[PDB]
């Protein structure tokens, strides 16, 4: 009986709502009320990486905090040495419709994907002196939005077919499939321990997934519109998501609800990327009003603004050591801030 | 700088040279976004079209130019999240089958959505009204009121075609956008000429707007 199932679902939703409300004894604003604000944070463009002849859609750091990878619609995946701005490798893509890129923690491989529905894994540390396509992971009936390496032989992808996948690169076959989203999944954030991750979708919801088991543990729904970016808090007990509602939100996995909203009346545009600082006190959000906002994660204040780009800020990253911030945009330029 | 640092700099410069050469080569192509309803004639728009699921990219070289058409029908997803990838296209080629009274009001809504999309406010549109012979033979029995109840007038080829074109052009509400209409049949072998002429005019108009004339 479908009516009974609908009523039971409504009852369970009400139970969860009441449980979450009972745990809201205090707000993050009250607890952190008596904390010294960060004041004004002025960061300057210490590097500007040039060479892409089109919009830059993705950008990832290496684990050495010196090498990064960038993906552009001109068919190029470029590896930059941030300190010297030198180009280490230029990878011509078989398809120029790239929407994501990832850097293996070891630095031996990079990942690429987009509207071709294939995650191409490229091997950098090879003899013969040239980067070659190690793998072409297929089996997504929709474009790839984000991809991340768990290790040199495991990769997690999110697709526009509402599904996430966990692949073994060597075999080339999906070892797990995560389903439950009703709209296309736009972002994907691996946990510090790489035991579970979070995926946000256009259904205005985020889901916490246990990588090993292959199931959704919790579902967070606060946004009015699509979630385009998700990032984990450094300790893995919270994460931040930015939506087209011109708002970012911080969710706590233990309280199973929302802790703080980051929005301003003078911001009415979408959020394309979010990232935390090493200590978790700064939340960097990239906007399509062509600038980035640096927020006090514990006070909802806007500590600073990064205004250097002439077009949409589409990708944003912070090094593992917390030293520099990389911003990419459709203006075809990357910038490093400190 | 050490010896290896200088060698790395030289490598970077060579990489930049190759990137510049590739960009120069690529800038000479014309990019077209091919849209329409299913079985609306997209696959046979240009008989010399060469194919080079996801995004189906076809290419053909006509009148000194290289044309790239990107068919997006395998992307059964939310357009609002990847449509902006085609913001920099020269034109949109919208294919419509006149003989299909069932697909209309899905093609019309799609045309309205694409015309009023924020990324394509100033992007010209080349409209193909295909299967004019089939429509002409079909209209003898059903006087176009099965699809357009508000229509009144002769149910012949000319007036009905004019009404369909008017319905499609009435959704343009932007001065900088032009709609080019060409009515084809299955046996027309001159669609490349139509696309070439439309693209030439669009480029000339955009250059005039740039120069301020």
């Amino acid at each position, epitope marked *: 009986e479908l009516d009974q199932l609908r009523q039971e679902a409504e009852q369970l939703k009400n139970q969860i709502r009441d449980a979450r409300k009972a745990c809201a004894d205090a707000t993050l604003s009250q607890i952190t009320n008596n904390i010294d604000p960060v004041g004004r944070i002025q960061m300057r463009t210490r590097r500007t990486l040039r060479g892409h002849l089109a919009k830059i859609y993705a950008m990832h750091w290496g684990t050495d905090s010196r*090498l990064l990878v960038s993906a552009s619609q001109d068919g190029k995946l470029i590896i930059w040495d941030s300190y010297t701005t*030198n180009k280490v490798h230029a990878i011509p893509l078989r398809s120029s419709w790239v929407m994501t890129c990832a850097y293996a923690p070891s630095g031996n491989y990079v990942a690429c994907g987009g509207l071709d529905n294939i995650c191409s894994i490229y091997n950098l540390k090879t*003899r013969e*002196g040239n980067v070659r396509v190690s793998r072409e992971l297929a089996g997504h009936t929709g474009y790839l939005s984000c991809c991340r390496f768990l290790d040199d032989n495991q990769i997690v992808t999110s697709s526009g077919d509402t599904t996430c996948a966990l692949w073994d690169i060597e075999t080339g076959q999906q070892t797990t499939t995560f389903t439950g989203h009703t709209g296309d999944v736009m972002s994907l954030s691996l946990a510090p321990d790489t035991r579970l991750f979070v995926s946000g979708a256009c259904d205005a919801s985020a889901k916490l997934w246990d990588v090993r088991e292959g199931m959704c543990r919790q579902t967070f729904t606060g946004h009015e519109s699509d979630i385009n970016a998700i990032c984990f808090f450094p300790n893995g007990n919270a994460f931040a998501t930015g939506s087209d509602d011109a708002t970012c939100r911080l969710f706590d996995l233990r309280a199973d609800q929302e802790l703080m909203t980051y929005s301003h009346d003078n911001i009415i545009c979408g959020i394309t990327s979010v990232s935390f600082s090493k200590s978790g006190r700064l939340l960097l959000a990239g906007y399509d009003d062509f600038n980035c906002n640096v927020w006090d994660a514990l006070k909802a204040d806007r500590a600073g603004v990064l205004a250097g780009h002439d077009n949409r800020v589409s990708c944003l990253g912070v090094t593992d050591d917390g030293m520099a911030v990389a911003t990419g945009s459709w203006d075809s330029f990357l910038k490093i801030w400190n | 700088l*050490s010896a*290896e640092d200088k060698a*790395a700099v030289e490598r970077s410069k060579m990489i930049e040279k190759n990137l510049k050469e590739d960009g120069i080569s690529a800038a000479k192509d014309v990019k077209l976004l091919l849209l329409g309803a299913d079985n609306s004639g997209k696959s046979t728009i240009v008989k010399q079209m060469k194919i080079i699921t996801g995004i189906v990219e076809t290419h053909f070289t006509f009148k000194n130019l290289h044309f790239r058409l990107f068919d997006v029908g395998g992307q059964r997803s939310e357009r609002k999240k990847w449509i902006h990838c085609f913001e920099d296209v020269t034109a949109i080629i919208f294919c419509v089958d006149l003989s299909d009274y069932n697909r209309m009001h899905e093609s019309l809504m799609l045309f309205d959505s694409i015309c009023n999309n924020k990324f394509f406010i100033d992007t010209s549109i080349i409209l193909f009204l295909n299967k004019k012979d089939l429509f002409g033979e079909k209209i003898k029995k059903s006087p176009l009121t099965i699809c357009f109840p508000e229509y009144t007038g002769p149910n012949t080829y000319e007036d009905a075609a004019a009404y369909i074109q008017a319905q499609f052009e009435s959704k343009n509400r932007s001065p900088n956008k032009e709609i080019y209409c060409h009515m084809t049949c299955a046996t027309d072998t001159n669609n490349a000429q139509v696309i070439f002429d439309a693209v030439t005019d669009i480029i000339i108009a955009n250059n005039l707007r740039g120069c301020g004339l």
Partner: single-chain antibody
Amino acid sequence: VQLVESGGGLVQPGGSRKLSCSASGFAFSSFGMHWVRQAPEKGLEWVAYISSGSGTIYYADTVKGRFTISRDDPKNTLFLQMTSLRSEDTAMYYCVRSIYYYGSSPFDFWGQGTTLTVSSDIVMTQATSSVPVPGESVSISCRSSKSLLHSNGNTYLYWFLQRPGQSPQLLIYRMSNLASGVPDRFSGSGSGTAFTLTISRLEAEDVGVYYCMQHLEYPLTFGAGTKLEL
């Protein structure tokens, strides 16, 4: 990966000869190339270098004006044209590939050289010319006239091994980095002007002549060689 040197043979003093190295199995155009010669009973001496794109060419002072290095990328060949040959040019000539980018491993592959018989610089010092030694730990020391620690943090010292009847192979690059294809028994350590190669649990096939080289600045200079013997 394969480099096959050819040419050479017996020539009379004052003549000329062309050596040609054919490359296979790797992207030749993306590599710079070196010519390094070893005299019949002496160590390794760097002769010439031509970079990728043929942009930068360097010569050793003992050959400058007489040797010309060139490369034909589409045929994947490297040429060394020698004129005004002397008796000191008698040696085995090896062609070596080298690629330079952040984290690269230059001097990774050497070819089987060709025999040619004819009828300031940083000084690398090897403490000992021979060290008798299976299962034992060995330490080989190397000194330089100038500190090899560059301001960027890289120490440009390289350790090569030449086994009996074989071309040198790369063991360690930049004083600490173990080359791909080398067991972890080898280790490199030290400080400016004083460097050590530690071979833990020495085995057979670890026996040969060990060379330390500086890549801080040209010309590239080698040590006389330390020989481990059983």
